[PDB]
Structures are given as structure tokens and as C-alpha cells.
Amino acid sequence: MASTDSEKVAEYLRRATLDLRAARQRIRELEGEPVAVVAMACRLPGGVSTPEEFWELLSEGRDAVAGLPTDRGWDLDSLFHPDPTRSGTAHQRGGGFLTEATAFDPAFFGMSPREALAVDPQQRLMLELSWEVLERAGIPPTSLQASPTGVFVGLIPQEYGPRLAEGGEGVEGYLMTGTTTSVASGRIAYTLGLEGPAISVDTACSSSLVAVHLACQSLRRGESSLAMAGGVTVMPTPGMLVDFSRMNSLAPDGRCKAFSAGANGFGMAEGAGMLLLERLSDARRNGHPVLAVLRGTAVNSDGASNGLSAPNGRAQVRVIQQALAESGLGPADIDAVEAHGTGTRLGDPIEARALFEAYGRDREQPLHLGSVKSNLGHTQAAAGVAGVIKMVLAMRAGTLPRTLHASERSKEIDWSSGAISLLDEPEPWPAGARPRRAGVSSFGISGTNAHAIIEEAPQVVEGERVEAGDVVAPWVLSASSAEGLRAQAARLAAHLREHPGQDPRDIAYSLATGRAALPHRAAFAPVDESAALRVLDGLATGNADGAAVGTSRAQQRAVFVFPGQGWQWAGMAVDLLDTSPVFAAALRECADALEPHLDFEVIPFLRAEAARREQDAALSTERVDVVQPVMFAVMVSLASMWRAHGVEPAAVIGHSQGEIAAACVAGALSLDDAAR
Amino acid sequence: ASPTGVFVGLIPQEYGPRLAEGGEGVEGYLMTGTTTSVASGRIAYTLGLEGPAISVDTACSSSLVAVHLACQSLRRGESSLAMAGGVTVMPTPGMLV
Amino acid sequence: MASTDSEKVAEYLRRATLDLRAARQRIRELEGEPVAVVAMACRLPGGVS
Amino acid sequence: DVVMTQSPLSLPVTPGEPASISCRSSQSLLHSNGYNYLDWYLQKPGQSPQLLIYLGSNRASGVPDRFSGSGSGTDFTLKISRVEAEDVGVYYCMQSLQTPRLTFGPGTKVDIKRTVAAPSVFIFPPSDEQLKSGTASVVCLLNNFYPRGAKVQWKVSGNSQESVTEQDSKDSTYSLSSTLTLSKADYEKACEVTHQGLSSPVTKSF
Amino acid sequence: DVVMTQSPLSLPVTPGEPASISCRSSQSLLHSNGYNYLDWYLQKPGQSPQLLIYLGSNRASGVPDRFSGSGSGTDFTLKISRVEAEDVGVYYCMQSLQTPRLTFGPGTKVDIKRTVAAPSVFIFPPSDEQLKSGTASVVCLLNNFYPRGAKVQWKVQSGNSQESVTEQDSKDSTYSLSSTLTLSKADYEACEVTHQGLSSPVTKSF
Amino acid sequence: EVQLVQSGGGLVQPGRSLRLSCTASGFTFGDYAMSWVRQAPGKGLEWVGFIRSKAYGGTTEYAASVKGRFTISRDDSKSIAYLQMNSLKTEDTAVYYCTRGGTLFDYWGQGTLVTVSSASTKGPSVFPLAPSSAALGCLVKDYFPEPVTVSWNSGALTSGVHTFPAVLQSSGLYSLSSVVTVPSTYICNVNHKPSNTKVDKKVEP
Amino acid sequence: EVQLVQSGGGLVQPGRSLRLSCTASGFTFGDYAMSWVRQAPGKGLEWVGFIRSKAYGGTTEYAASVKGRFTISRDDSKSIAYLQMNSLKTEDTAVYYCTRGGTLFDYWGQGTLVTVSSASTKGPSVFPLAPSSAALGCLVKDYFPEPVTVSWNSGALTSGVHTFPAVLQSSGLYSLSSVVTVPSTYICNVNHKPSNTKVDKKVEP
């Protein structure tokens, strides 16, 4: 019975409670599942091309505002006139502009040079950055075929090529596929084969952040197991500078003097940043490296502000408060905010007042206010993804970056509260009892205000074990071109010469699991970091020394062929058995299958090399009754080893006695059947 | 000031003079009036809507994608009302060429 | 407690069941709640307004 | 007395179609707490049973909300909203008002629903080398018939056993094996079925 | 016996800060079913109480997830994750094991936390027209003090003093006390406090 | 949705009967055991009793202080829970509550201010506060029942205003002390709604 | 997460003891009452018994068919539930289950195929099926225990193949009838893993 239903009811109470404990953690993962930053890829103003080089721009306080690009064929002579109202002229005399957005690798993807010429530089910088953000995550970019992986890339329509009405000479039908923000999310999903939702957001100076908010939703609801979010503003023609000049809003120097009294305009910059978003449960279950965690992102509009361009105060507060409420975090839980900091003399005051309202009203410690645009410039639709890059790197390095051109804090902002500390000096941000949290704000010119909360990656990665092994795992690297093959060994050699002490097995695992099998492959089995960087120094020039090189287009399945007699030496299985645990196991298995019918156990005979196999009227394995069983014993074991290391035969071929091995390894006969 | 998101489906179109070739009165509105981003922004600003004013772009499926994202912003709950749809008006004869 | 052997634990089961019902309905109100089309505005070819 | 709790058998459900399984209950299972004390169990063929719905209407976690449930004081109804191809097996009307639960219930044969076919009655005389081996097994094979509501007679019965496979996927029928284990002498002294696929018995002998 | 349930009966908590309220249970409330039998109740000042957490850890529906809960066999802990301007009231640690439930407990004075201020001891002799009206009420007013852990003495003794302490306002977040010394005709011909805002008693008379 | 709105407040003397009804809407009334809670003003709650569900049957268990005085009944067809007050006394002056369970008071009625006082309805004896040399106030002694609002400068001064709670004397009357704290000649007005005794007052040291 | 993996299968004769262990992982073992269920092959389930939680204490209740034969124990520190089989007989040939509750079998172990048969391990008497004039088959009479795979054309023909379930005779042996239905001279092979009796067969009408 049930103590008169006492057990019964309680037994039902133990299920309605356990179901409630499971139906409430489902809501908590449907609305507030912490989504992680698996990997980070960026092309930002200056020399920045990787997230680690971008930290070499924030930590040493370098400004990326250098000057206008000359690669793009910009006129540069009608761009500047003494008259500020002359049509066709720009006001900023510089800004951080990408020096590599003009160039692209067409042959790497399935893109023709004719097609790639018409591809928007915004779009051609999301295919390479899609490849980078996947290789940095340890996820082979070609492994994500027909998989749910949504793409959320934010752009601005802008203008790259000629008028679509007039067409072109060489580029006629691919002008469309270039100058369309739509395909700027579908092209990435097509080249990488991603089946996940390909949304191309458009939200002016907040596009990227907004995109991540959407992506966050995708992972929280579960539409896409992987999210691919970020934004870009690549600047192909000087038109956009010419016309923000018409509102007299660009800083003549092109510098984003965020929260500064010398703010004479919001300036401009062109750049790109990209993120790989995955829910923390999926990211850690699949082993994907977690760099930081987005907890909550909110997106709102300025409403009826003082025009479409002017920002709104209360709406900005309502988005930096909603993100906290949606993330389950608060004003005191954020240690350092990354505000928009567009740089105009009007946006910054109201923007700082909003920060002083949601955060500064209730602060235990001074909030470390920063702005990535100070070091870079206003990257427009790439702002919001550059800001999250700044916070995560500040989190991974334990240091808060400087806000350049912020020594003279703005006189129009009341800093007397002290709850907000402008980051004019590098403030240490060490890991402690409080989980490190940050906030990135982007307020676009369209009026859409967005804010995201970035918690530090939960420090559960610690606890890894250490060991040593004799397995010289091959250092496999592949490229789409011979020159790229010679460049993927030079960059790796530089990385293993500028980041020394990285274990060889760790390097092989990342090079093998994390790099796509591209149709120009070079592979070698290193024994030391000096015998490897020497091979990596010969592979960079093209000399195949101690390595294997081969172009292998349209090739993915091995056949195992089985030679007959001819290796009369028979002195190699000893070294393989002593160093391979399987070769001391599978060889034992086949020998123990040969013994019931042929009493000769191979292992005592194997340790007898050819040097000790010629005394008692014998030669190097010439006894047919003795050579054939020991030929087979090594023969089946070796085929098991290629299958134990992951190579399966597509076909089997047996010259004379390989037919016996065809019986065993192909499943036609068992080990006992084949050995007999 | 009521939560109401504007989700407009748009394919970027070339309307007037080039951005580097601003007109006589249409100087700084050749992008503040044409950039797809501000199409939903103008709706949110003139109507006073304070919600997710996101301009989506997924080619000919952009309207249904805007509808889906507006619904998903309603399902979770970020704007009490949601404004979803899409438009293709072709000012120049560029697309059909 | 007093009558038979369940009048306090049964209240807890009732509350837990109601909480599960109000929490599973929340899941279906967060991923499967019908979304009504309040009105349509359309500008289409052929003079449609 | 023991409450009688039995669930109607022969439940033909087809993918994409809403079904409804009810149950019988002699003594009322609506306990004084206001909660029914019956459960709904599904034994997946070749796998362990699963908790679907407890307390009459409350569903378990893990199983999707497709398993909706309700009922009156005595009459119960599991409203399976919809069946897919994985939703096949045996449903159980286990009550929970009187431990012991030694009888779980005959169980409901939930089957992929399809129109009625013609059972292929195939009489098979045993091999003669079996007759010189010491046994005799004449088999009246039934193939491609649904639903499985027929037993094979043995005239000109009592030595017949049962052997039926579960449903396949692309054909969704049943197959029956009536094995008539026999002895030496009695071999030289017919099988028919009463399946609803036909009306008149079909008599074919060895 | 009766299980003695006692919590830190005062929790100065400030908005945006995580607090933690515990409880004494003299006996073991971890029943044989494996579930604690303690309830967490919040009486909102000027409104009805609310069910926060039942069975020791299970939160109720409707209330935010802020009220998280757990505990040992005897020791319990309501982990209020965070407090706001709304989260201020009386929290009751009610054991639900041995019915009757007469005592709900003294209750926990949850207060907006702020540093310690100086109580403004304001002695107020009663009006003379009251003295010719038939009564006498000298009031020792206390204003802008927090926390409220002081009672007013009446020397030169006590026993005729009643308390009229107000609640906590929003922008100032202090308390105000009214020690009314109802008196009679002849006895008309001093008050001090022992609040932690000061150390030495401040003696001022009518 | 669920509502447990109450009704049956009033002013009585010790020794008479009073009505308390618990309106049930939104649920099956016969499932849960209706309970009744009493809250003394400004201090600790005290539980009165409950009735078990008619499906359970059981009995009606009450608090030790209300044996032979209060009884509780229930009905499904008309869905009202009853707390019957008989032979009322002084302690019963409190706001009673209707709770949704004998052991799990998950719901909570809004509260009916049941008052059992021996006083009668009359105007207040507004007595001022001459400052020592500071704050200025005005006591509102001897009034009944308890609707009350005391403003300063006739609702013009709102900073520093402290409307002190009701003060329960043994005579059944009430006393309020509204005092403002500001250096200076101030106006305090007390309005007793039931009696229309509208007293205006000028105060000096 | 929760797992209730089992162990303790085997082949026994009527009248000896067998072991059944229920591995508990992911939860507090002493809270739920461990129960044991028996599933006759292809037909209705039958419940064996349960042990109450040591917090409850209680007793060990069993089915009417296993009085004095089976006993059930439990322990927290090592977290294994026991079903002890003593004086086993023929009916016990079934797949037993470990359920997570005396009245609420919310979880369900994968199932241990406990077999109590009097037969011995030997090859099958493969007996063919001469078609009447149609379908072609071949029997697997007289084999034990029950691992079995019967293919046609040596795993080449898969359409129309019907691997009929095991047939329980009174002698403790098994019989299988794999038959294909296709107009025509076919090959059927039966492989008994324990005994290595690999029989190939050619069939004609």
C-alpha cells in the first residue's frame, strides 16, 4: 500500500515537483539561456585582421584613424573644398579605413573573378571572416554542411559598383548578387552550406548588435543550434562621408572623441567584426571553446525623438535596463560598460545621462565607461560587434582598454556623481568572486537602440589533465592553393615561433580538428619543435623536406590494397608492437587465432629479427609454413591500424595471400576464420 | 513610447543621385531617406513606437522573414505589438535589367 | 495529519500541479502562442491600395 | 474488490491523424483529494515502457505535450493529439488506488492504420526428412494481413502455437505462423482462418 | 512539543544587492517523504501576504524567480537573489508540519538598507489648553532614524508610553517614532533614547 | 483566473455577531480547504481556523483562542466560505484574511478590517505642538473610527510630513500626531469623514 | 541526469538462484521506493514487488505469485537495488524491469532477459518449406538459447523477408520460421552464435 496514500500522493508530489523543476529550467533556457562566444573574427580599422592583433591596438592605446583609402579609386579631389556646403565634398580628413577590403580571394570559394569583382566588399569580407570565425573555433568550416547554423550579418545598402540600370561590361549578371544586403547572409550560408536562418539585418550604427540579439533569440528558442552573428560596414565609395558632412556631423579629423570636450563630430570608420554564437549548454557539451558569454540583449527604438537622427534619452535607458532584466543582471552587476560613444557633441551627453540613469543611479563601484570607436572610429553597422570584441578581449586579458581622446571629460556631462569612471587609463580587470560582466551599447542613426550584457566565460575550463605520449600526431595543414599552402606553413611557423611552448599534440589536434581538408595538403609527423619549424620553414618555400605534399582535388576515400610476399626482412612489426598498444593487442588476437591451427605464436618469432633468423639453417622468413601465418598476422594487424586511426578501405585488393586479409578486415570472415 | 516593433522587409534599391553626387536640396537625405535601416526607423519615429525597429533583408522571402522575426519577438515578449511586412518598389530600372 | 493520511501533502501536490500547468502553458505561450493578424495594409500592383 | 481497469484493444491509428483512447473503471478513481489516481504507460516494442500521463491528466517531462489527457470520475480519455511513425506500441491503463499492481493490464495494440487486406493463407506440409527425423511440423503461413484478429484452425486443433511479428514500416501488415507440432503416426489422418479480410473460410490442406 | 521556528528577524537589504534569510527549526522538518515542510510567506505592507516558496525549495507560480530557496534538515535558507524598491516587507518562516498553524512567527522586518543616521530627539511639552481640557500628552518625537531599534524612556517612571512608529518612505528611507505619554491632571509637574545612531543617551525634558 | 474577494467589515461592540464571507471564483470550491487568518494591526499574524473539504469531510479546526466562539462552513453550489463571529471581544479588532488551504495558504484575500471597539463616532480633540525653541505638529487625540487624513498648510507642505499611525488607547479612541520638521507658523487640518468635524489650527511656540 | 541501468541476466534451470542489480545514478537513492517489474515475452506485463524507502521504512510488498521466493533490498551508500531470485521456475523466463516507484513507475530500466529454461545449448534442426505449387521458407526447429539471425540468399534478399519470432515449446527449445514470398531456388542460412552450428540450405518444391 502507501501508508494510506501517504506514499502514493508523495510519490506523485515527487514527480509534479521534478517535472516543475524541469519545466521551469526549460523556461529559463527559453528566455535566459546564456549564449557563448565560440570564436571571434574581425577586420577593424588599421592593421587589425585577427582578434589578437586587435588587443595589440587597445592595450597600447593606438588610434586607427590614419586617413582616407587610396586603393578604392576614390576621387579624393572633389572630396575636400573650402566651402563646407559644396555638393560632393566630405568634411572628415581621415578616419580608420581598411587597407585589405579592396582585395579578396575569389578562387578560394566557389566564386569566379568576374563574380567576385561585382561582390560588395561588405559581402566579400564576410566570406573570409566566416572562414576565420570557424577555424578559430576549432570547427572545420566544411564540417557544417546542411546543419542548422543561422547567419545574422548587418550591413548598410551603400553603393559599390555602377548603376544596375546601366549594367556593366564584364560584370552584368553578378552586379545583383554583389550590391544586395540580402545575399550578404545567404552567400555565407551557401559557401559554407549552412542551412540555418540567413538574416541580413539593417539597423544603421547598431546593425551588428541588433543582429546578435536576433541570433541570441535563435539559440534560446532553439531554431539554430549554432548562431553566426556580426556586422560590417566596408566603405567602397566616398559618398557616405560626403553626405553625413551635409548634416555637419562628421569630425573633421575623423576621430571619435567619445565623451570629450573636443568632440567636433562623430567621425567615421570602416571595419568588420564577426562572432560565433552558441548556447552555453551546446557550446560546452560539444567541446567548443567558450571565450565569453552573452547573457541578455535588448533592442528598442528611440521613438519620436528630436528627429530621426537625434538620439533619445528615456528610450536609451529603457534598452540598457531591459537587457539587464532580460539577462537577469543589473546596474551593480556590470563592472564596465562599452557604450556607443559615437563622438558627436550631442549624442554623447544624452548617451552618458542614460548610462548615469540605468547604471549610475545605483552603483557600488564606479562604472568603467569605454568606447571602441575612440581607438577605431565609428564603424557604423560594424559597431556593436566591435564593442563586444573589445569587452571579451578585455575579459580574456584581465585589463580594461583605454578610451583615446578622453582625457578632457565632456563638460556637458555631470560626472560629479562618480558612479561612472571614464576609461582614460588601463584599469585592471582581474577575475574574482564577482563574475565579470560588461555591457555593449549601439544607438543607430535609424533610431533603433540596442544593448547587450557580456558575462565572463564561467571558469569551468580549469581542471584539464596532463600526460605525455609517444604518438607523433601528424601536423596536417591544407589550403586551396599552392601559394596558400606555402603561406599556411609560414604563418603557423611564425605562430609557433612567436607563441612558443605549445605542446605538439595540442597543435596537431587543432590543425587536424579545426582546419578544413582543403585541396592542397601538406602533412608531416614532427618529433620536436625544431624538426617541425624546420619542415614549416621548407614548406613555406615549397621544399618538401620531412613532409608529404599533394594536390588531391575530388578525393576522399581510401582503398586498402594487400601486397603479398616481398618484405622478407620482417623486422618492422617489433617496433610497431612496442610503441602501439593496439599493435600489442590486435596482433595478439590474430596470433591467438593462428595458434589453435598453427602452433607457432608470432610474438616469440617476431622479436627474432632477420639478424637472429639465419642461424638454425634458416633465412629471412622463407619457411612457407612459418612465413605465411606471420605475414598474415602482421598483415591483418596493419589493416586494423589504419582503421583504428580512422581510415576505412573503400575496396579490398589481395595480391596472393591478401585474399585472406580480405576475409578478415572486410568482415567476410572472422579473425579465427581467416587465421585458420 | 509603447513597445511596438517595426519589421520591414526591404531589398536595397537605387532611388536618386549617387551618395557621392548629392543634389541641390537633397544633400544629406540621399542616405537618411534611402538606407533600408531607416525605413522602419521612420515608422518608429513618426508614430513614436519604442520597440525593436529592425529592417530585415532576405531577398524575396524578406517579408515572411520579417513576419517570423516579429512573431518570435512577440512569443518571447519584447514589444506588446509588432509591425511586420515587406515592400519592393523599384524606382530606377536597375533590377529588371 | 487528521483525516485518513493526506490533507497537507495533497495541498502541496495540488500547488505543484497548478505550478506545472502555469509553467508549461508559459512554454506554449513563449514558443507556440498564436499570433493574431490585427490588420493588413497593402500597396499592390493593379491599383490595389 | 479490485477496480476493473481495462483499455479498449485493436486501436488503429495512422500518421497525421488524431485518435482517442478511453478506459473503464468500476470503483471510482477520483480520490477525495480531487485528483484522479490512474496512469498512462506506453511500452515501446523492443524498449522499456514510458511514463506518459499521471494523475489522469498531468503529463510527465521528456515526453512531448502531444500526449494530452483528461477524464471523468470513472471514464478517462488520453487525447493523443496526433500519431507519427514513432508513436507505435502498447498503451497501459494502470490505475493507482490499490497496491498491489501485479496486473498492468492486457495493453492496447496501437497499430499503423490502413485499409483491410487479404490474408495469404499458405498451407505448407512438413518436409519428409523431418518425418524421418522424428517430428512433424505443418505450418499454415499467414502473410500481409491487417488487423491481426484471426487464429488458424487445424481440422481433419490443440497442437498449434502462435508466432506473429510486429508491423513493418513501408508495408504495415502482419504475418502469422501457426506451427502444428505433431508426432510420428498421426501425420496421415487442413487449415482455415476467420480474418476480417474475407468472410467465408478458405480451406486448403497439406 | 512545538518546533521553534526563528529567522534573523531583521534584514536591512538595499536595492540591487543579494541577501539571504535563514531560519531555526528546533525539530527536524525533513519529513520521511524527502521533502521539507516549511513555507515562505511575504506580507506586503498594506496588502495581503503572498506564497513565495513551499516545501522548503519549490517556488510558487506568479512570484518572480528572485525568491530562490533551499535548506538542510533543520537549517533553511531563502536565497533572495536580489531586492528592488518593491522587495520590502515582512517574511514569515512558517513550518507546515504539525497543524494547527496558529503562530505565523514574529516576522522579519525587511528594510531598505542604508548607513546609520542620527535620531532627532525632539521633546514636545503638551499644549496648555489640553491641560485645561482634562488630559496631558507629552510627546518625545523621533524622526529620520534607521534602523528602528530604540524605545523612548520617560523618567523624572515609564509605563504610560505607547508607540506610533511609522513605516519606511522612499527617497529618504528612514523611520519616525511617536512615544505618546498619556498623562493625568496632577502629575504634570524627560525623554532619552538608546538608538545605535548614538552611544550616550541624550536627555532633554519638557 | 482566481479571486478570493471578501466582504463583511463593520464596527461592533464586544459581545455581538458579525458576518464574514469569502467569495470563490475561478476554481473548484470543494477541492481546497478554506482557512481564515487574523492580522493584528501593525504586528504579528494569528491564525483562526479552517474547514476541510467535503470530499475529505473531516472536521472544523480552530485556534485555541476561539473555541466555542467562531464557526466555519462551506458550500459548492453557491461557492461562499463562511467565518461566523459570535460573542466578539476586544482582541477581534483586526483585519481578517481568507486563505486557500489548511496548511498551504497559497492565496490570500485582500483583508476586511474587522473592528470591535467600545467607542462611539465623534470628532477629534486636536491638540497642538508648541516647539521647544525644531518641528511643529498637532496631535489628533480622541477620535473614532479610523478614516483619517492630516495635511499641513492644507495640503501645501509635503516634505517632512510624517502622518503617524493610529494609536490604540484603552478607551477605544484613536490618536494621530502629524508633525512637520522645518525651521520657521504652519497650518494643520484634520478631516474626520464620518462626523464632519473639520478642525483648522494655528500653532505658535 | 537519471540512469537506472540493470545487470544480472543469464540462463538457469528451474530451482536455482539468480542475481539482479539496479544501478542508481543521478539522484538520492533513499527517496524513491524501488520496484521490480516482469515482462512476459510478447504479452502482458506482471509486477513483482517493491521495497519502501528507508526514510519511510515500511515493508517489502511482493506479488501473489512470488511469496516466499523473491526478496528485495536497498542501500544508499553504495546505491544498488536488489531483486533476489530463489527457487526459480518456468514462468520466470521473462525480461525483468526496475521501476522508480511503488505506485508511480516513472522511470524504467532497459530490461534484463532472465531466462529459466530446461533446455541445453545445441544447434537447430533446420527444416525447409517445399512450396505447394507461392512462398519459400525454412524452419529453425530445436535451438537454444535465443540469439538468432536468419537471412535469405545469404543476406542478399531483403524484400518480403519475415523473420518470425521465437516459438516457445514445452521442451525448452525454440523454433523460427523465416519465409520469403516471391515467385520463382533460394538460400536461407541460420547462424547460432553460441554453438557454431552454421547450416546452409537449398529448397525446392
Automatic annotation (TrEMBL), chain A:
First and last residue shown, out of the full length, are 557 to 1201 of 3545
Q: Per its database record, what is this protein's job?
A: Involved in the biosynthesis of antibiotic erythromycin via the biosynthesis of its aglycone precursor, 6-deoxyerythronolide B (6-dEB).
Instruction: Give the highest taxon in the source lineage.
Output: Bacteria
Q: What is this protein called?
A: 6-deoxyerythronolide-B synthase
Q: Coiled-coil annotation: which residues?
A: none
Q: How does it assemble?
A: Homodimer. Erythronolide synthase is composed of EryAI, EryAII and EryAIII multimodular (2 modules) polypeptides each coding for a functional synthase subunit which participates in 2 of the six FAS-like elongation steps required for formation of the polyketide. Module 1, 2, 3, 4, 5, and 6 participating in biosynthesis steps 1, 2, 3, 4, 5, and 6, respectively.
Q: Where is the Ketosynthase family 3 (KS3) domain?
A: 32-456
